[PDB]
Scaffold this motif. Structure first.
Motif, PDB file in Angstrom:
ATOM      1  N   UNK A  76      -4.197  14.670  -7.425  1.00  0.00           N
ATOM      2  CA  UNK A  76      -5.104  13.750  -6.763  1.00  0.00           C
ATOM      3  C   UNK A  76      -6.489  13.717  -7.394  1.00  0.00           C
ATOM      4  N   UNK A  77      -6.869  14.745  -8.144  1.00  0.00           N
ATOM      5  CA  UNK A  77      -8.129  14.715  -8.875  1.00  0.00           C
ATOM      6  C   UNK A  77      -7.924  15.225 -10.293  1.00  0.00           C
ATOM      7  N   UNK A 126      -3.683  11.000   1.532  1.00  0.00           N
ATOM      8  CA  UNK A 126      -3.481   9.936   0.554  1.00  0.00           C
ATOM      9  C   UNK A 126      -3.304   8.588   1.231  1.00  0.00           C
ATOM     10  N   UNK A 127      -2.550   8.542   2.327  1.00  0.00           N
ATOM     11  CA  UNK A 127      -2.364   7.278   3.031  1.00  0.00           C
ATOM     12  C   UNK A 127      -3.656   6.818   3.682  1.00  0.00           C
ATOM     13  N   UNK A 178       0.820  -1.201   0.000  1.00  0.00           N
ATOM     14  CA  UNK A 178       0.000   0.000   0.000  1.00  0.00           C
ATOM     15  C   UNK A 178       0.859   1.258   0.000  1.00  0.00           C
ATOM     16  N   UNK A 179       1.868   1.325   0.873  1.00  0.00           N
ATOM     17  CA  UNK A 179       2.772   2.468   0.871  1.00  0.00           C
ATOM     18  C   UNK A 179       3.499   2.639  -0.449  1.00  0.00           C
ATOM     19  N   UNK A 180       3.894   1.558  -1.104  1.00  0.00           N
ATOM     20  CA  UNK A 180       4.601   1.672  -2.367  1.00  0.00           C
ATOM     21  C   UNK A 180       3.707   2.136  -3.502  1.00  0.00           C
ATOM     22  N   UNK A 181       2.409   2.282  -3.267  1.00  0.00           N
ATOM     23  CA  UNK A 181       1.520   2.782  -4.303  1.00  0.00           C
ATOM     24  C   UNK A 181       1.444   4.301  -4.351  1.00  0.00           C
ATOM     25  N   UNK A 182       1.862   5.006  -3.298  1.00  0.00           N
ATOM     26  CA  UNK A 182       1.898   6.465  -3.392  1.00  0.00           C
ATOM     27  C   UNK A 182       3.123   6.888  -4.202  1.00  0.00           C
ATOM     28  N   UNK A 183       4.322   6.606  -3.695  1.00  0.00           N
ATOM     29  CA  UNK A 183       5.542   6.448  -4.482  1.00  0.00           C
ATOM     30  C   UNK A 183       5.710   7.462  -5.604  1.00  0.00           C
ATOM     31  N   UNK A 184       6.094   8.697  -5.310  1.00  0.00           N
ATOM     32  CA  UNK A 184       6.352   9.652  -6.391  1.00  0.00           C
ATOM     33  C   UNK A 184       7.342   9.082  -7.396  1.00  0.00           C
ATOM     34  N   UNK A 185       6.981   9.206  -8.674  1.00  0.00           N
ATOM     35  CA  UNK A 185       7.741   8.916  -9.894  1.00  0.00           C
ATOM     36  C   UNK A 185       8.004   7.426 -10.086  1.00  0.00           C
ATOM     37  N   UNK A 218       3.788   1.905  14.013  1.00  0.00           N
ATOM     38  CA  UNK A 218       3.055   1.952  15.267  1.00  0.00           C
ATOM     39  C   UNK A 218       3.574   3.022  16.214  1.00  0.00           C
ATOM     40  N   UNK A 219       4.844   3.402  16.101  1.00  0.00           N
ATOM     41  CA  UNK A 219       5.446   4.374  17.002  1.00  0.00           C
ATOM     42  C   UNK A 219       5.567   5.748  16.361  1.00  0.00           C
ATOM     43  N   UNK A 220       6.351   5.863  15.289  1.00  0.00           N
ATOM     44  CA  UNK A 220       6.578   7.153  14.654  1.00  0.00           C
ATOM     45  C   UNK A 220       5.313   7.746  14.067  1.00  0.00           C
ATOM     46  N   UNK A 221       4.254   6.970  13.959  1.00  0.00           N
ATOM     47  CA  UNK A 221       3.111   7.373  13.179  1.00  0.00           C
ATOM     48  C   UNK A 221       3.124   6.688  11.834  1.00  0.00           C
ATOM     49  N   UNK A 222       2.247   7.162  10.957  1.00  0.00           N
ATOM     50  CA  UNK A 222       2.061   6.521   9.664  1.00  0.00           C
ATOM     51  C   UNK A 222       2.854   7.222   8.566  1.00  0.00           C
ATOM     52  N   UNK A 223       2.561   8.502   8.316  1.00  0.00           N
ATOM     53  CA  UNK A 223       3.234   9.201   7.217  1.00  0.00           C
ATOM     54  C   UNK A 223       4.747   9.186   7.307  1.00  0.00           C
ATOM     55  N   UNK A 224       5.395   9.303   8.474  1.00  0.00           N
ATOM     56  CA  UNK A 224       6.859   9.212   8.463  1.00  0.00           C
ATOM     57  C   UNK A 224       7.360   7.831   8.132  1.00  0.00           C
TER      58      UNK A 224
END
Lengths: 361, 361, 361, 361, 361
Positions: free
Chosen positions: E360-361, E170-171, D306-313, D339-345
């Motif tokens: 995104x859109x 996005x995530x 799932x994370x590798x689907x955002x993946x700029x370029x 679980x610790x740092x959060x999701x986006x980082x």
């Protein structure tokens, strides 16, 4: 309960700044005698307990308690009966409760006086050592670390501190000081005489009419196993005369009172006698040191003439006339700088002052 | 209540700075004996409780309590009746309450003396190790981290610290020190003899007339299950003579008093005997170390001649005459720098001092 | 009242710095046994209460209280009458009050000894791990963050820390260490044997003549519902012999005393037995680890030969002779660096030391 | 008095750093059960008060008080008379005072064990998550704010943190970890089984022979208004057998004692039963989560894929073989970083690790 | 004594950061009910005092005290005699001492649950508002002051914060959130229903069989001057049945006990009823707000479409399709940013997000 005071003890014990050798036994003396005095009159928070007879209702027990504490007590070894009259029974009479705990405080104060004499006297002399020492000190605390001045380290003392000291000498020398060394040795004479007087006060304390105390006699008894009741003096069980009032006036009787404080007092008069005679003999030799110093004064210069012998490159100015310019005042204050800042930082100072001393001589 | 003092214990236990090996058992000894002494005379805030008969009104109980505590007590195993006269009953007589808690404080003080002897004696020698060590120390605390000096790290010790030490030696060597090592080994002799004397004081404590204590006998009894009443000594239940006064003078009787303190005292005389004999044997070998050192002195140089063997590039100056210049004084102070700063920072210092030693020899 | 001491517990529990694995059960053991010991002799600020008969005036109650506590107590299940003589009644005799709370303190101390043995022994070995670890540590604390060194990160360890460690080895290797690993494994043997001896002291505690305790028997009883009075041992209600004195000497009677402490003592001997046998078995396997290590030593190198396999670019120097230069000493101190600094910062250090090791081999 | 301890509760309640979801109910469980246990044995600073008859002199009242507390108590609803013998009267027998307050402390400890198992086990696995998380954390705490890196923000994770993590994997993967996920799911199995065992201990507590407690029965009674005396169990007024001794041995009587503690104990067994069954069911689903995870493992990759689907370029490297390089170890530690740092980082970190993974696969 | 705890009250009362409107009446509710509960069971450190007759020896007074407190009490207005049997006398039976002080603590906890539901539920949703809000917050705390960004102030939000938020969306949008608004409105439904249930617990408290309390009736009585004895309920003077035991079993009598707590309890049930019904009606309208919001959703966009009307230069992108990209998730989190950061800092954020929303859109 428990009383522990760190800070107030640290105030005298630490705060006023000097390294003066074994003159800090005034500093610690005040602490020992002050703490002992304040502890004894605290009564270990019952001074004395008594046997008072059967029919007293316990508001009288709490009376005859004090009335025995305040009014004197005495002692007889037991089995003599009571003897008779007022005399043979009262021959040995032990009351030092009135004196000891307060006269210790007075002692401590009389140990603190000499420092005061020295501060006031140096302020009379015109040249303040406290400021100078605390100055050249932090001068040596700043650039000791800094690596920029080492090959220059000698030339560093030349400009900044040495002109300060050597400048103070010009002002003082015009006002009431060639003599400050003499004032100092009078201060230390006062120190010694004060110590011996205090010791003599310990001796003549208790009561001279019934013996007197000095340690090797008491230990020379206890360690022979003479305790008290068989040594005839210094008891822990004391009889107490007592007086009511009726149309028959006196009505005195004898009520023996177990006496606790006497277990402390002669446990610490064995210590405190040794420790005061030690403070005496270490304070009295410190005095002859300075009378010797003040007298010969040809061997008072050995330390300075010693520092001038390391003397890189040993430029020009002769030896004697330097002492001619520095002799009365600075020769002392140097012996003060060596005692506080240490030794090596003083040698740099006295080898720098030789270079810049021209205009004054 | 509860008394917990962290700070005052941390003052002696920490504050004065030295790593001296197992000479810090003076530091911890003072704490153990001082805390034990101050705890025992605190009476665990009832020392002794007694059986006093039916008709006493409880202001007498609170009397015969002390009068039994102060006046001595004794012991008999039970069923002997009372025997007779004053002797066979009083044969075994247990009062060490008078001595122990105070004589411990005296002990502790006599453990603190030797450090004082060493400070005063080094100040007599003329060269102060405290300042030097604390100096080259923070010199090693600053630029150990700094990356600018490593390839230069050897040349860094050359200019700044080594000239400081090697300069102090010039001053000291002219005043009352080639000998400071000898002064040190006298200090450690005093350490050992002091320790053994303290131990002997533990032994001769209690009373020599009735046995004496040393551990493997007491444990060699308890662990055989001899407790007290069947071992004939060291009781927890003591009879107490007692004296009123009437026209018949003495009127003595015997009132047995349960005695609590004796449960502590011989729980900590089993510990404190082992621990003092340990401090003795670890302090006495430390002394022979330094007599050996002071005597042979050809193998006292093994550490320095060892450091000079790493010696990058090993430039020029020969070996022996370096010791000829450094021999009496510095050879010691180096053995001090290795003990405090660690080992590797000292080797750099003693390999630098070899390079700049010319002018002095 | 309430006593909560966070700081003093944090001193041993935290302050001395090491991550040593499960050797910190000495650290926590000292805390458990020290706190239990200091809590028990605190008496939960009444140890024992008693039934003493009608006509005692309450100054005797406060006597027979101690006289029952100090003098022993015993137990009989009830309804046996009293039996007779001194024996059948005293057969089961419960007094462990004398031992337990103090012998725990002694325990704790004997858990603290092995750390002392290791500090003194490493100071005997000549190479101090504390300084080295705390050094390469903060080297890794500074420039781990700094972004200027990453592509250089390998070359960063080369100059600054690795020359420090690799330089310490040169000094130590000349003085009494190829052996420091052996000294360590002797320290851990002492650890194990110490643990088992302590456990055995728990067992033989109470009294071996009347049973002995080990957990699964006691829990194997309580959880069967045998309490005390029906299990025949370990009571909470104890009879107490008692002795007056008259012209008829003994006059003993039996006064049953409810006994509180016995509710704590065997609630924590169920816990503390499990916990000591756990400390024993976790400490004894840690020892065989190091005898295995010291013996085979061909598989002691697996971690280093493992780190050298990551090794970017793997320059030149062969494998074996690196161990020939590092073998006796450093091979250990590396197993120490991995344990404290972590793993990845150690691999950089041991891959850097391979590059700069030439001159020494 | 009042006892409020904020700090010690904050030590366990806060200090050890992790966000682990609902595994922090071990953290809070230890606090609840520890505080309850330490509060109950504090006796609310009178546990039990009793009716003891007229002629006792109040030193016996303070005896029969304990002798009733220690020796058991029982209950009969009132008006049954006393029945007879020892049985029908003692049928319902309420003593849980012996167990509860201590067995709670034991509970709390057995809730703390699993965290210890996880720390020791991760240190066995070879790759320490604590260091890594605390590292990439403060990497994200520094330059999250700094505006110089945003357009570079992706390339920032590339060099500094991702080489650290991806480098740790190389070391660990050679030593005893492809398995660390399995070790984790064993830790959580231990968590669940531990919870259910604790709950079962609550049930079987009191005594199984006389009922057992589980909440909806007790509340299903109280809220019907059955109190105690009419419900036949769990009383607040308990009779107490009592035993003197005379030549007639037993002499037992019955003295009813009002009993306070029983007002607390079943006010908090209604709460603490609900709260333990809640901790059980929230801890047991957390376990099936990880068995599911460990088993399917094709849907364990959904978050990474799932994370590798955002993946700029979306540069080059394929999908599957990235998992081939990362699969056993990192796939877990990523689920820890999220679980610790959060999701986006974390997404930045796992999209950076895809770019630099070549050499390893 | 006095108990004042500022810090622990400040922990819940302050520390967890949110401005949520009138959802902080959970925060203050927990404090009021927790402090009241902990104060009442403190017994104002005598709950009940009683008249017990002449010949009781004062160890029975201290018994019949509890035995009256624990066992129930009742009330009769006075002069009715005692009536007869067990019923007419016990008709009005006042014991709420058992419930109230504990059931308040339970109340408080059940007020704290909903916050927990919201934290756990937002962590289930996948997008953490706490991190985002605390981020864009301190972004607005840094450069609000800095004068370098104002003419750029709009373009400042464009790069740094808006890419962070818009990146988190996005995530989250790929994992279990289009719905987070729905989760929130379920949380607030739980809030309302929880409040009303708590209120109903106050009502049904005391005992429903004897009246029930709601404020305007009680004040509608007191302010008419009906006190208690003439209102027939809620007394301060209660009779207490009492039971001895003899061969005649019951032997019950009636001893009237003055009852203090009843002066507090209905002084704070007049307050706490008003305050709970207020928390109820302010919490229940907050819920219909969000059902309205969730339902219409065409007027949920009024605030955003309002912010986009200020919009300097109003560049390009149309209106509706922006909502098409932002609709499910961000439309909420914006209503969260406005509530915490304030209003004006949110408008900049939502006018910036319109510019960078293309990809995104």
């Amino acid at each position: 309960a428990i009383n522990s005071v760190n800070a107030l003890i640290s105030r005298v014990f630490v705060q006023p700044k000097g390294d003066l050798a074994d003159r800090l036994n005034s500093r610690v003396t005040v602490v020992i005698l002050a703490v002992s005095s304040a502890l004894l009159l605290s009564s270990h928070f019952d001074p004395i307990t008594c046997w008072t007879p059967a029919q007293f209702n316990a508001q009288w027990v709490n009376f005859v308690n004090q009335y025995c504490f305040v009014h004197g007590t005495y002692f007889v070894p037991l089995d003599q009966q009571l003897a008779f009259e007022e005399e043979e029974r009262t021959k040995v009479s032990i009351q030092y409760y009135q004196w000891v705990p307060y006269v210790f405080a007075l002692q401590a104060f009389l140990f603190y006086i000499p420092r005061f004499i020295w501060k006031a006297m140096i302020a009379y002399s015109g040249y303040d050592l406290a400021a100078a020492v605390k100055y050249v000190d932090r001068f040596w605390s700043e650039n000791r670390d800094k690596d920029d001045k080492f090959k220059t380290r000698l030339a560093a003392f030349e400009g900044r501190p040495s002109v300060y000291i050597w400048d103070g000498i010009r002002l003082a020398r015009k006002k009431r000081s060639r003599n400050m060394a003499l004032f100092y040795t009078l201060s230390t004479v006062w120190q010694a005489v004060n110590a011996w007087i205090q010791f003599y006060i310990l001796t003549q304390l208790l009561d001279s009419s019934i013996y007197t105390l000095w340690g090797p006699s008491i230990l020379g008894d206890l360690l022979q196993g003479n305790d008290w009741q068989t040594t005839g003096h210094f008891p822990r069980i004391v009889h107490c005369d007592f007086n009511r009032r009726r149309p028959a006036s006196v009505q005195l009787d004898t009520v023996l009172c177990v006496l606790t404080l006497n277990i402390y007092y002669e446990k610490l008069f064995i210590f405190l006698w040794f420790w005061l005679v030690f403070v005496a003999v270490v304070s009295t030799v410190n005095c002859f040191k300075w009378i010797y110093y003040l007298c010969n004064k040809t061997k008072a210069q050995k330390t300075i003439k010693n520092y001038l012998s390391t003397a890189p490159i040993k430029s020009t100015i002769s030896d004697d006339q330097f002492f001619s310019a520095l002799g009365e005042d600075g020769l002392f204050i140097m012996d003060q700088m060596a005692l506080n800042l240490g030794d090596i930082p003083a040698s740099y100072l006295t080898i720098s002052m030789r270079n810049i001393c021209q205009d004054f001589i």
